[PDB]
Amino acid sequence: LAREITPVNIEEELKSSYLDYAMSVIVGRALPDVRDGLKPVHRRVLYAMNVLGNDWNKAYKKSARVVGDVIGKYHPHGDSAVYDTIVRMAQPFSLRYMLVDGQGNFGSIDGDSAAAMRFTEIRLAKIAHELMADLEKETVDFVDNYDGTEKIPDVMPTKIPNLLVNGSSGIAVGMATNIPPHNLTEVINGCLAYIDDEDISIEGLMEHIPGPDFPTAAIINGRRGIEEAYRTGRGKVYIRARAEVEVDAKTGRETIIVHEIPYQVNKARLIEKIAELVKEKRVEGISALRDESDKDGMRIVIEVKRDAVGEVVLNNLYSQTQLQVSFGINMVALHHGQPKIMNLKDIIAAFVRHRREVVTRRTIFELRKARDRAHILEALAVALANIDPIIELIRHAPTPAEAKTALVANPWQLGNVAAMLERAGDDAARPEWLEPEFGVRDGLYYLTEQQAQAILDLRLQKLTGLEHEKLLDEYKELLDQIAELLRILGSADRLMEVIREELELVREQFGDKRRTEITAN
Amino acid sequence: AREITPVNIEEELKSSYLDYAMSVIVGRALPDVRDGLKPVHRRVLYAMNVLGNDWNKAYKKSARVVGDVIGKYHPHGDSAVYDTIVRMAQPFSLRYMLVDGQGNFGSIDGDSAAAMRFTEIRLAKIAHELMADLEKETVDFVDNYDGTEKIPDVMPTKIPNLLVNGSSGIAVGMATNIPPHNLTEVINGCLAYIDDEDISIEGLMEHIPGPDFPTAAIINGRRGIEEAYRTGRGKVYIRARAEVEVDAKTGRETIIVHEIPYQVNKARLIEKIAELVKEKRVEGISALRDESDKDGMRIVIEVKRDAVGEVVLNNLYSQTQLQVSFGINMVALHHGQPKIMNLKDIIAAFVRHRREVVTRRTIFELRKARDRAHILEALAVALANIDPIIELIRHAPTPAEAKTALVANPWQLGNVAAMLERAGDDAARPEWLEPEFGVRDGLYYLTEQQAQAILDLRLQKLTGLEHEKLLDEYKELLDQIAELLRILGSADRLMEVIREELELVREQFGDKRRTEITAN
Amino acid sequence: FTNNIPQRDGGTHLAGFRAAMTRTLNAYMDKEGYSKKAKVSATGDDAREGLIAVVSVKVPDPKFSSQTKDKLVSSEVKSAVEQQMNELLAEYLLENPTDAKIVVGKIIDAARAREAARRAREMTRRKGALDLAGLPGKLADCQERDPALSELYLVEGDSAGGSAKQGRNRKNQAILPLKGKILNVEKARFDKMLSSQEVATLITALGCGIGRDEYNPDKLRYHSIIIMTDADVDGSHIRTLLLTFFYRQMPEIVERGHVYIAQPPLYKVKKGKQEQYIKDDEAMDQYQISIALDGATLHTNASAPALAGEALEKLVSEYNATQKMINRMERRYPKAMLKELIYQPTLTEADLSDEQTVTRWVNALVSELNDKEQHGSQWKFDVHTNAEQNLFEPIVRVRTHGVDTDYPLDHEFITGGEYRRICTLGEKLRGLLEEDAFIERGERRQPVASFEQALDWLVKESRRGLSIQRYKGLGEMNPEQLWETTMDPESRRMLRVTVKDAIAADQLFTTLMGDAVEPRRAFIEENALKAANIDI
Amino acid sequence: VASFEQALDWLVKESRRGLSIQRYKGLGEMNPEQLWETTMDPESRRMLRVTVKDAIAADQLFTTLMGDAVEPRRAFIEENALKAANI
DNA sequence: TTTTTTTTTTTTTTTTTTTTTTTTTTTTTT
DNA sequence: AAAAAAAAAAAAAAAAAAAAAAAAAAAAAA
């Protein structure tokens, strides 16, 4: 009826609006995808940087330009949040392996905030390029942006297990994810073990992956939390600071030196809290408190009084202030576009399945490209064999269309060079869509419209003697490449060989040492 | 190389403040006399043009344009580039808007524009004619702050943007304040100057009676306009359009303000009227309302029965901001230095700019046409003798050897090539080419570029129709070269071209007067 | 009518007719002073009371919302009808005084009845230039002193506030811009209600300080409170927060029906001259389908007439519903199998008794899957002899990405309802495309081998000149666009908030908006499962 | 080459082949290590002591450049512009 | 020994303010 | 009459805050 006013129930409107908001947040800002381990914001930011050409071996670009490109094209949710995401990706105390290379002030663990968008400059890290390898080979599905004027990837064809490696943290409506970082070498070793035996136990995966590895080195107190998290997806882990108790040789006084602090702990807030506890007489025996972080470590001096044990004071500080914190693991991620609590083996299996899909799609694309180029090279070789009557036909023709019709209508003899060329790999080297009407048929080659157009686009520069041999060599190389790609597609073992070689290369290039210590308790 | 070196406070202060003063005066504060733009406007328009924000293309988000301007060209941080874009987009500021924005861009009521993430930006149609023939090296390009790119030093304008849109900016030593004008009248003044270069300021006053603000209004005097257009400085009083409406049923009167002066906020105006009424500084006001119903504006001021109404209106003119004194101060950069300048100086500077732009464009087009004619001569000679050229290219082992053979061999002129080449004669060879090459005693001597173009020739172009295409293109290029040489040779033809362009600009973007000049 | 074709659902011509009639009658009432004597302002649905009209239009290239042709979405028609009506109806009113006076008498009687229908109230002091009345500085108040004629628009910020303030009617519309997301009163303590954002709404509404001994809804300053947030996800969230505030703190206002919801459009879509506003993604999908079937003809043979537009619409609707179902069933079975099952013959439960027939059917299915394959997957069949029920359930193996999996088509899958719908769509599309079939979109010609090719070609041709403008809030809409869509009472589309059941409303508010997370997560998961499992 | 202009232009163009300039729009664009290397470390510092050679001349310069009156400031700026333009 | 309210993430929605610089006017104060 | 002080026009330098949405630890009321 198209009435100006209609009734709506408070229940129906509330339910529809809140369910729409909750599902939108859950699927589209809060949780990461299990495959590439990135949220949509990170995916769109990296895609914008890659499209601009912020390569790891090129000059920096200002954050304002990248943020404007992200907001204008891909991500319509305001520039301040996008710049904060870029800042978190650039800084090294947040991510275990930084996806962005920063040039300027990006904050610190002392609590300093990052510089404004107009000062800093950004650039992709070298790891982010392997996070987007073979993106151009249609290895992942592309989806429209908010306007529909551009295309964004649905997922990145990653070579790194970014979810386990860099972790994640987000607050959806019903859900909330919290995944710690890990060591890339240990994670790749676990992936290789899973590839070797897919019925591998969580005990074996934990032998290869002893536990998390935060960007700030520290001590993990227990292991029961790690085992519970990696066998169920939830568990509390206690992270302690690498404090000590120095004893002066000359005098009997003592000092406590905090070399490291837990993950996601602010130095300034921690020092303020310790000062408040000392002022309120909550913790006794603290003679003084300062920082001596002289860019050769991280030194926090806590002087002990003469009438104090010192170790008792250190234990009291571990109990009370934020020198010990509990990391609540909650491994929630999007799997098949829905939230799911998942353990370590599920994440590794999802990554290996993603690698299978990516390599198969890449091989299909490369095979199609090679077959098309071989088709064009067959046309060019057959044309160069019969270049004189082709020149006569084109000269006699009034227009290029008549030349196309004449070339298509006239079958062509191969000649010695093309006949010798088109002997090895005559089968399984033609494009699949090509009908049997065209191609070689009892010596006489038959051209298509595309081949005739390619022949007409041939230049006089390529009529020299050397370019003919160049075309023959290119055709032989394409035949070898097609044979190798078909061998990859035929055998499932060769797919695993290729994936294992790629993972070993990734472990070699970006391998790193473990920072934390998983002590027993 | 001392760690610490004493410096006098006088020298440091002088050097630092003079650096700041010269930088502000040259770069940011004052506009350029030729294109009428500041560097911010120039860089914004150049960034939008490079992005391809055409007037008929779809809009783009303002954040993308601001980020592109800041990242590449303008090193002075966002949130001022967006403010300049907002001012260029909104119509009550500029007489002819250079940006066609979408969304909330503010209002005379005093609403601020929407944030950067909401609005969208697109060039106006007139902004393209402000940047016409930029690609034809008609202006000098200056390097970027990083040196990675280049920016125009000045736009090759067709509109007198300084007189048309006006300007307002504050430098350290100076300060400019130029009102806007009507484009048809300013173009008529330019044409009058072209017709008679020794024209007095009275004739330019006849063609250009005064400024034409985007908000229609009334200008009381004319001696201020005459002083501004003679000396470059004058005071102009801008009155509001207010009429005392007498009701027919009863004798009560209401003052209805149809239009407001330039650069006056309606909200502050109504607040000041309310303050005057509450403090009893203006008597006779019964009620005060705003009734702007999206059909102009309407500020109703009900007058009490015990009040004349005309007296109340005169008091509102004298006390309130319904009258504003617009101080004209025509300071603009001329040859990279500030200078107070009158109307005839601005018109002469614009005409000199158009002379330079048209001459540089004609030189560029002549060079391009001569180069293309050279390549077409090469292709025609190759098509005349395609058989031995095919033989030589086939027998050569590498393309470099083929180029050397083609350059070494002097080639016979075909009958079609013989008729084609001799008709053109001179005035088609490029200037840089030596006399060694070209036609010499009925034999064409190819160059290296011509041989490379022949080797790049496709088999598609051996057809019959493409030979006729090359012949027709060569004849058209000969005619174009003749026309360009005629334009460059004569100084009267240069002014004919400039006058035709100005007349076309007046035809496309013609507009009527908005403000009224009166005698009082 | 449009070219002697009726339009049940009106169209642009109907809107132009309504707007012109209302404008002319209001102008005539204001000029002659009948409104002043009666002391009542006429509104919409009173000038249309007891009316008969026929609006015939002849467009050369009409454009309709659907092949059923119930709406005319041609943008060119509204302006011409509006201009001609605004001239000639005013000329008619000037020439004929008696009939105009009689019609004005009828309109005044209707307006008096409408005013009599309303409840008792009191005129309220309004923010003005001379007097502010202690109201917020961000309130752009109206000139009407009487409530039940004024209306308050609650918007999301100062940019949306400016966009709404520039385009409105100062006599009635008042705007109170908020600041982003507001407090969740369900979670927040009552002491936290003393906040800058929420106190602004309390001051303007004048329901006192939402206390037990002070909340008096009779002193409400506007009897129409309109929640005009943005047209996106966070706008919906802020709408839910505002509904929580109104229901929990001022339940009498919601019961009396003063709360309204505006529906601004999220998208504007343009194709050459024509423009249109779209609300949500499903409306965008329907519009895309409508353009795809706009001037589209499908021939089953080289020499055969084009199909009916409504029949093609029904086919495309069934196909899209089945494709959505197949996307829902991506977890259970491969998409390629489910798509291929459309074109294969139906398999009934009686066929399961025989073994050779099932082997032939699954062999044909797997052969067609292998023939049309364009990835690395390889399809193979296998029949499992169920000795319990004497059945033969086929199984289709697939080795995709080097991973082998089995997808047995159980006895429940044959009679699962999803396969019934697939079979019905197959029965529609067994032979609607011969070898020589093609489609046209004017002078363009395209032979098509399958329905997917025809649909894809139609979509690609539809999206050639298409341009889409997504509004990320009301600050991106011009004031004219925001006025014409969801501020003008003629072209308004509002929703009255009402409480169907108090107990259910309280339970839903507590579950969705309370402190406890477990019922909220359970509710979200259950609704996600219900959405996924719509088709049995 | 055939002119000094051609040689200088070719030399400059080859100079700017691999070049890359990073302009710092304030200290927020510099890394803290770059700040330490340049202008915080006392080893590699380059400072300047502010000193007053003449009190009267300093007072006159401060009043002219920073006072309320604009005309002496304009005259000073114009005189320095002319001095820069001339030898 | 037990409730209750407060801090912290990291993506989202929203706004706000202080100076420099020059003419010109309007207050207000003597 | 007279001086001094405040505001606003447009490009520059700087920054400041309020809420949702989960978990999980303090730190007081009860």
**DSSP secondary structure string, A82-100?**
HHHHHHHHH-TTT-SS-SE
Decide if A122 contacts A63 (C-beta within 8 A).
yes
CA distance A185 to A165: 10
Annotated active-site residue in C70, C234, C280, C488: C234
Decide if A407 contacts A447 (C-beta within 8 A).
yes
Q: Which residue of C has its CA nearest to B268?
A: C129
* CA neighbor of B156 nearest in space, from B359, B321, B458, B457: B359
> Are A115 and D25 inside 8 Å of each other by CB?
no
- In 10 A of CB A80, how many CB atoms? 11
CA distance A483 to A477: 10
User: Which residues make Cβ contacts (< 8 Å) with residue C230, sequence separation at least 6?
Assistant: C156, C160, C238, C264, C471, C472, C473, C474
**Does the annotation flag C270 for ligand binding?**
no
Distance CA B235 to C1' F2 in A: 24
Which of A105, A108, A118 should we substitute to test contact with D (largest number of D Cβ atoms within 10 Å)? A105
Q: Which residue of C has its CA nearest to A172?
A: C521
Could you tell me the sign of the dihedral formed by the alpha carbons of C331, C334, C336, C340, in that order? negative
Annotated active-site residue in C82, C198, C230, C461: C230
Instruction: Return the bridge partners of B325, or none.
Output: B237
Active site residue C70: no
Smallest Cβ distance to B274: which of C130, C163, C472?
C130
C contacts of B271 (beta carbons < 8 Å): 129
B287 interface with C at CB cutoff 8 Å: yes
Residue extents of the structural domains in chain C:
134-262+479-515, 265-323+417-478, 324-415
Task: Sort A473 into a burial class: Cβ within 10 Å, 0-12 / 13-18 / 19+.
Answer: exposed
Active site residue C232: yes
Active site residue C318: no
Smallest Cβ distance to B118: which of C130, C167, C472?
C472
Decide if B457 contacts B386 (C-beta within 8 A).
no
Distance CA B55 to C1' E19 in A: 38
A contacts of D31 (beta carbons < 8 Å): 103-105
The token pair that represents B70 in the structure block? 């800041």
**Does the annotation flag C67 for ligand binding?**
yes
Which other chains touch chain D, taking contact as 3+ CB pairs less than 8 Å apart? A, B
Decide if B31 contacts B38 (C-beta within 8 A).
yes
Decide if A246 contacts A255 (C-beta within 8 A).
yes
CA distance A153 to A161: 18
User: Which residues make Cβ contacts (< 8 Å) with residue C53, sequence separation at least 6?
Assistant: C17
> Are A103 and D32 inside 8 Å of each other by CB?
no
Q: What CA–CA distances, in Å, run from C273 to A31, A202, C276, C466, C484?
A: 42, 64, 10, 11, 18
* CA neighbor of C249 nearest in space, from C282, C279, C205: C205
Could you tell me the sign of the dihedral formed by the alpha carbons of B412, B414, B419, B421, in that order? negative
Burial A374-403 (b: 16+ CB within 10 A, else e): bbbbbbbbbbbbbbeebbebbeebeebebb
The distance of C95 to chain A (nearest Cα, Å) reads 33
CA distance A65 to A118: 9
Q: At what angle do helices B81-89 and B39-51 cross, to 10 degrees?
A: 80
B17 interface with D at CB cutoff 8 Å: yes
How big is the CA angle at A153 (ends A148 and A154), to the nearest 5 degrees? 100
- In 10 A of CB B290, how many CB atoms? 19
Closest protein residue to F14 (Cα–C1'): A116
Decide if C348 contacts C414 (C-beta within 8 A).
yes
Does the fold of domain C324-415 match that of domain C265-323+417-478? no
* CA neighbor of B55 nearest in space, from B119, B126, B116: B126
Max CA-CA distance within chain C?
94
B448 interface with C at CB cutoff 8 Å: no
Closest protein residue to E7 (Cα–C1'): A269
**Does the annotation flag C156 for ligand binding?**
yes
Active site residue C230: yes
> Are C501 and A11 inside 8 Å of each other by CB?
yes
> Are B77 and D25 inside 8 Å of each other by CB?
yes
The distance of B71 to chain C (nearest Cα, Å) reads 24
The CATH fold of domain C324-415:
Ubiquitin-like (UB roll) (3.10.20)
| Distance from the first to the final alpha carbon of chain C | 42
A contacts of C249 (beta carbons < 8 Å): none
Residues in chain B, overall count: 520
CA distance A187 to C448: 50
SS3 string of B78-93? CCCHHHHHHHHHCCCC
Q: Are strands A332-334 and A339-341 parallel, antiparallel or unpaired?
A: antiparallel
> Are C166 and B119 inside 8 Å of each other by CB?
no
Radius of gyration of chain C (CA): 30
Smallest Cβ distance to C130: which of B119, B277, B294?
B277
Which letter does DSSP use for residue C190 in this model? G
Task: Note the CATH architecture for domain C265-323+417-478.
Answer: 2-Layer Sandwich (3.30)
**Does the annotation flag C30 for ligand binding?**
no
Instruction: Return the bridge partners of A171, or none.
Output: A176
Query: What 3-state DSSP class applies to C41?
Result: coil
The token pair that represents B45 in the structure block? 């328009």
* CA neighbor of B141 nearest in space, from B346, B462, B360: B360
Smallest Cβ distance to C475: which of B115, B271, B273?
B115
Do D and A make contact, counting contact as 3+ CB pairs within 8 angstroms? yes
Instruction: Return the bridge partners of A340, or none.
Output: A333
Smallest Cβ distance to A14: which of C401, C466, C508?
C508
> Are C240 and A17 inside 8 Å of each other by CB?
yes
A53 interface with B at CB cutoff 8 Å: no
Do D and B make contact, counting contact as 3+ CB pairs within 8 angstroms? yes
How big is the CA angle at C479 (ends C474 and C480), to the nearest 5 degrees? 125
Task: Sort B462 into a burial class: Cβ within 10 Å, 0-12 / 13-18 / 19+.
Answer: buried
Which letter does DSSP use for residue B72 in this model? I
Q: Which residue of D has its CA nearest to A122?
A: D29
Q: For residue A342, is it left (φ>0), alpha (ψ between -120 and 50) or beta?
A: beta
CA distance A421 to A379: 12
Resolution attained, angstroms:
2.9
Annotated active-site residue in C156, C294, C393, C418: C156
